[PDB]
Amino acid sequence: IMGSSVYITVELAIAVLAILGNVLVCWAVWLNSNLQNVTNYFVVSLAAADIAVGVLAIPFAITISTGFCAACHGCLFIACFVLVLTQSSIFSLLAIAIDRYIAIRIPLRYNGLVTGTRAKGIIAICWVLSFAIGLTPMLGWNNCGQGCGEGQVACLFEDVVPMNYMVYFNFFACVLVPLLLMLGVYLRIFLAARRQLNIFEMLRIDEGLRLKIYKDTEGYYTIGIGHLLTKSPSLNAAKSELDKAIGRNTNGVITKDEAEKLFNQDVDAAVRGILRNAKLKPVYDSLDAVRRAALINMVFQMGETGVAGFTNSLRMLQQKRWDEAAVNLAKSRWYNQTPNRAKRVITTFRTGTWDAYRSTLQKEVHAAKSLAIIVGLFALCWLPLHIINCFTFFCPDCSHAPLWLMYLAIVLSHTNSVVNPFIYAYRIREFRQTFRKIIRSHVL
Ligand SMILES: CCNC(=O)[C@H]1O[C@@H](n2cnc3c(NCC(c4ccccc4)c4ccccc4)nc(C(=O)NCCNC(=O)NC4CCN(c5ccccn5)CC4)nc32)[C@H](O)[C@@H]1O
Numbered sequence: 001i002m003g004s005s006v007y008i009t010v011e012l013a014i015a016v017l018a019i020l021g022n023v024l025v026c027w028a029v030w031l032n033s034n035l036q037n038v039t040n041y042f043v044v045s046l047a048a049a050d051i052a053v054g055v056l057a058i059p060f061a062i063t064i065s066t067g068f069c070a071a072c073h074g075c076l077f078i079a080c081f082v083l084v085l086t087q088s089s090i091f092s093l094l095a096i097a098i099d100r101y102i103a104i105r106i107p108l109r110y111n112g113l114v115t116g117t118r119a120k121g122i123i124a125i126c127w128v129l130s131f132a133i134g135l136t137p138m139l140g141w142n143n144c145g146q147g148c149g150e151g152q153v154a155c156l157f158e159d160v161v162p163m164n165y166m167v168y169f170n171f172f173a174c175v176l177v178p179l180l181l182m183l184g185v186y187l188r189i190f191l192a193a194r195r196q197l198n199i200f201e202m203l204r205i206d207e208g209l210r211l212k213i214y215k216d217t218e219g220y221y222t223i224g225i226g227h228l229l230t231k232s233p234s235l236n237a238a239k240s241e242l243d244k245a246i247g248r249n250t251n252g253v254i255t256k257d258e259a260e261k262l263f264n265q266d267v268d269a270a271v272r273g274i275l276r277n278a279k280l281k282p283v284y285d286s287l288d289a290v291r292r293a294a295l296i297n298m299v300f301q302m303g304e305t306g307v308a309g310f311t312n313s314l315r316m317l318q319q320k321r322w323d324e325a326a327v328n329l330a331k332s333r334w335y336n337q338t339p340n341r342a343k344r345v346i347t348t349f350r351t352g353t354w355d356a357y358r359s360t361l362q363k364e365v366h367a368a369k370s371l372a373i374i375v376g377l378f379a380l381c382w383l384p385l386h387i388i389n390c391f392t393f394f395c396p397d398c399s400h401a402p403l404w405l406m407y408l409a410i411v412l413s414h415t416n417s418v419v420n421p422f423i424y425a426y427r428i429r430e431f432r433q434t435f436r437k438i439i440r441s442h443v444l
Pocket of ligand 1: 066083158385389409
């Protein structure tokens with residue numbers, strides 16, 4: 001079997017899978033309303049980039065390898081488009097990555113930051129950037145300012161696209177940097193996923209963390225986790241009290257480190273409050289650190305009068321009757337009014353461990369494994385090819401990778417540029433379910 005014949009065959013087999021698989025992803029997002037959030041706007045956008053990679057880029061990439069005599073600029077144009085379209089995937093994959101970072105690590109600012117308007121804008125930015133970079137060769141940086149006769153060359157990627165372009169501008173800027181950002185995103189999600197738990201993380205999950213001043217339920221300026229600054233209607237008075245509490249000019253913004261110093265002051269304040277209260281003091285003294293955190297949690301929610309309202313349930317906690325206490329607390333107005341928060345706090349009371357709060361993280365251990373898969377593929381599929389280029393460009397004298405290896409590298413580059421949404425999308429239950437619903441219907 002001819003080598004070239006095996007290349008064209010595998011490459012078109014990829015072309016089709018790309019089309020079929022990614023249509024599938026856009027189909028799912030079209031039916032299921034519950035899939036029509038903003039993340040999936042980035043997913044579809046990649047879906048689409050990848051469809052054009054399958055329908056256009058791959059056929060042009062094949063052409064580029066046959067070496068027929070073409071007008072240099074005609075063959076430059078074909079070459080450029082494959083660069084544009086593969087470029088679009090990479091960046092579009094990166095928007096997906098950055099979308100996830102914000103959704104997992106700064107979830108209280110995600111809506112008012114990645115809205116539908118901005119998403120569509122960011123997609124414009126990706127596509128415009130792809131053209132800018134991929135069309136650069138045509139604006140002059142190319143291999144034919146000065147066999148086949150005059151004006152024509154053998155149509156092969158390396159005959160029209162300069163190797164210094166591909167290494168210095170394209171590799172370093174359009175593969176290495178995107179990859180490196182994706183790596184940092186993965187790692188930072190991972191550290192969030194597997195974070196150590198304590199009273200600070202506990203209340204962040206229940207109340208949120210703000211690093212910037214916001215007006216509250218009833219118009220009062222606040223910061224961190226639940227920290228009232230002033231009742232005064234002035235942002236300027238608010239920031240002034242913030243500076244006095246922190247110890248520098250904030251301009252209304254703090255660090256996570258600093259909001260922990262605040263939270264701890266508020267905790268000390270709740271403990272002092274509890275110690276003065278004769279209905280709570282004994283219950284608090286009898287408990288262990290983690291159940292103490294549960295008791296303090298209720299207080300931050302209801303104040304101390306309210307917590308002292310649970311006479312029966314407080315009694316049972318003092319007598320160490322955990323299951324009997326849990327059931328008692330679950331009958332309240334508190335449970336019915338805010339059930340998620342209460343069930344987590346009641347489990348904490350039942351167990352003396354952080355389990356209820358740990359489970360809240362399993363959805364981001366999920367997200368981190370996904371990013372890991374994407375980034376690992378991405379490195380696998382894009383590096384051999386660009387590493388091959390660098391060796392050719394820096395060390396032209398030295399031993400070559402053999403033909404089948406160099407060509408496999410291209411095949412790999414195009415596999416990632418197609419099967420990327422699908423893996424991300426396949427690992428989500430809501431997608432996986434919709435896939436099944438089409439497959440056992442419109443197909444059959
Ligand atoms: C977002 C970024 N986008 C991309 O990276 C996309 O752009 C395309 N691309 C990116 N570098 C590409 C690239 N490097 C050129 C590289 C090479 C060649 C073949 C396979 C992989 C890499 C090369 C290395 C060394 C010398 C010249 C080119 N060759 C092609 C592309 O068609 N080659 C196929 C067509 N040529 C050829 O058979 N020449 C032959 C190969 C064997 N000979 C050798 C070998 C060693 C030394 C001298 N002579 C004679 C020339 N395509 C590329 C590819 O589709 C990527 O997905």
